[PDB]
């Protein structure tokens, strides 16, 4: 009967029956023609369910119908009655369930994948809704720039991110470790023999995942633009390039974030002649991306006009080349439509974004588990290439990566707290729940200085312990909401214990300190409810040991690695602290 959660969430989808189920084995039909990753995808998706396919037609199994448009295939068109992909963009599909039969039409095959992922979705114990489906994403190029600071990914991290980058039609990822040399100490060096096997692996991932694998250089560090010594410089940028090129890459990005040469004449003669060199001669790269040296709008601009080198990269870059920046800062609450009309006008193109969120390099104490929040939904206006900068921890970034495929998609209808509840239960399971109560108080990242941005952190208990505040000071009956606070912080405990207990290790790893901070301030919160009951009861002694309590728990807290609630569990403690009810 029912649409199981999806994402991103489709463009358009009807419900036109109550549904079917899957048989045991299945006609499949379109395999000669349709793209070959997209029906990998399907195939691995069948066998991980034992859905067999028939040798033959038609035990009167369910029939599955696979192509992209303009593929022969006379039995796609019968099946989808009237809808198709053919009016759609690149990387768009058609998806019609419809009584025993499933259609799949991608624009393209990268639309065919997509497809497929939707089918995936879709299918709960063989059950499957009956819908009529158009889909295609708001943004060009949607994914992650792998930009962070501190412990690297592994290779196994990466090889996994490929895959859920995929799964949630992400088609996009900046490699650009700290930890690669090839890409900045040696940014000259074609990868030498025992690094290639790692690499072929990632653009061999990438390219069954439709994921633009694309190869950020950094030569800033010590490259030269005046005379011989830049054209010698030039010349192995391009020699580094073709390396690249000859083991598959087709996307590529040239940085100038880190360089001591603030020459915006430089850099962009640098990606001009890159471009054309390059670029053009070879015909299948992808537009050149960089990130210039000013890349936030407080470095960009001064008075609302260009300051001087983003005046000069600006009139010098070529119209093609991808142009990245951060938003109004390099951490920041929000990218409001204003800031992408004024630097998009400045540059005369279409943005690229590079997020700083949910990376947590600047403050790692903290899990930034929220959803893409402060992005305005109109931001496709001015921008057509979105990427986040995530965590070191791989795997819980996947939570607001999860949102960021909905943001980037179909954005008109991005919902950050929809997309966040979905994100969670979509990833969690039987967790959901309670990896829900935990990441609640995990979203607001602030490091006291430059850097802040997310939701602010469980906003509705933060609401109701104000209510609690101005209701104990203002002489009315609190008893209610001193109640319900009991409740919440006795759950926030509880999640956390059984998330401590039952989480498997690959997010335990990541964030099993945090879990015992939660729970910590959980602890104090309930303590310091105990102070305002004792203080409601005049019982001296009462009192004074839930005080003991409180400001242990918070002296935990603020001597621990972990940091979380700031605002709120944590701010709770201090304030009950200081609130002294014989005062009102
Ligand atoms: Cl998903």
Known sequence: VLVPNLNPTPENLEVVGDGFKITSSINLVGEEEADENAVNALREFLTANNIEINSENDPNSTTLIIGEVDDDIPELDEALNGTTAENLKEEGYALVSNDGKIAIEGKDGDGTFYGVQTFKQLVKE??????????????????????????????????????????????????????????????????????????????????????????????????????????????????????????????????????????????????????????????????????????????????????????????????????????????????????????????????????????????????????????????????????????????????????????????????????????????????????????????????????????????????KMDELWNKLSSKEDASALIEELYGEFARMEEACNNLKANLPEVALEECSRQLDELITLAQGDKASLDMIVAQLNEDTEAYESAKEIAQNKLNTALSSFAVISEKVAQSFIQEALSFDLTLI
Do not use: C
């Open 126 to 463: 063989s059950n499957i809704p009956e819908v009529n489906i158009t889909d295609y994403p708001t943004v060009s190029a949607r994914g992650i720039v792998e930009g962070f600071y501190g412990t690297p990914w592994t290779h196994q991290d990466r090889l996994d991110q490929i895959k859920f980058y995929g799964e949630n039609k992400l088609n996009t990822y900046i490699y650009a470790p700290k930890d690669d040399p090839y890409h900045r100490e040696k940014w000259r060096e074609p990868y030498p023999e025992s690094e290639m096997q790692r690499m072929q692996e990632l653009i061999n991932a990438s390219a069954e995942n439709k994921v633009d694998f694309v190869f950020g250089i950094s030569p800033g560090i010590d490259i030269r633009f005046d005379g011989d010594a830049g054209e010698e410089d030039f010349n192995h940028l391009i020699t580094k390039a073709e390396s690249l090129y000859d083991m598959g890459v087709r996307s590529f990005a040239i940085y100038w974030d880190d360089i001591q040469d603030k020459s915006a004449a430089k850099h962009a003669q640098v990606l001009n002649r890159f471009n054309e060199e390059f670029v053009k001669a070879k015909g299948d790269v992808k537009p050149l991306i960089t990130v210039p040296t000013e890349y936030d709008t407080g470095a960009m601009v001064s008075n609302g006009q260009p300051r001087a080198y983003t005046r000069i990269f600006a009139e010098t870059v070529d119209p093609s080349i991808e142009v990245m920046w951060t938003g109004p800062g390099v951490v920041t609450n929000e990218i409001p439509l204003s800031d992408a009309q004024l630097i998009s006008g400045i540059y005369n193109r279409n943005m690229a974004v590079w997020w700083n969120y949910p990376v947590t390099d600047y403050f790692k104490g903290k899990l930034a588990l929220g959803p893409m929040h402060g992005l305005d939904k109109g931001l496709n206006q001015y921008v057509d290439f979105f990427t986040v900068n995530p965590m070191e921890h791989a795997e819980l970034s996947k939570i607001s990566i999860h949102t960021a495929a909905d943001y980037s998609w179909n954005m008109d209808n991005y919902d950050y707290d929809k997309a966040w509840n979905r994100a969670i239960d979509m990833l969690y399971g039987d967790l959901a729940e309670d990896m829900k109560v935990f990441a609640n108080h995990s979203t607001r990242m602030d490091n006291k200085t430059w850097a802040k941005s997310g939701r602010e952190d469980a906003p509705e208990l933060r609401a």
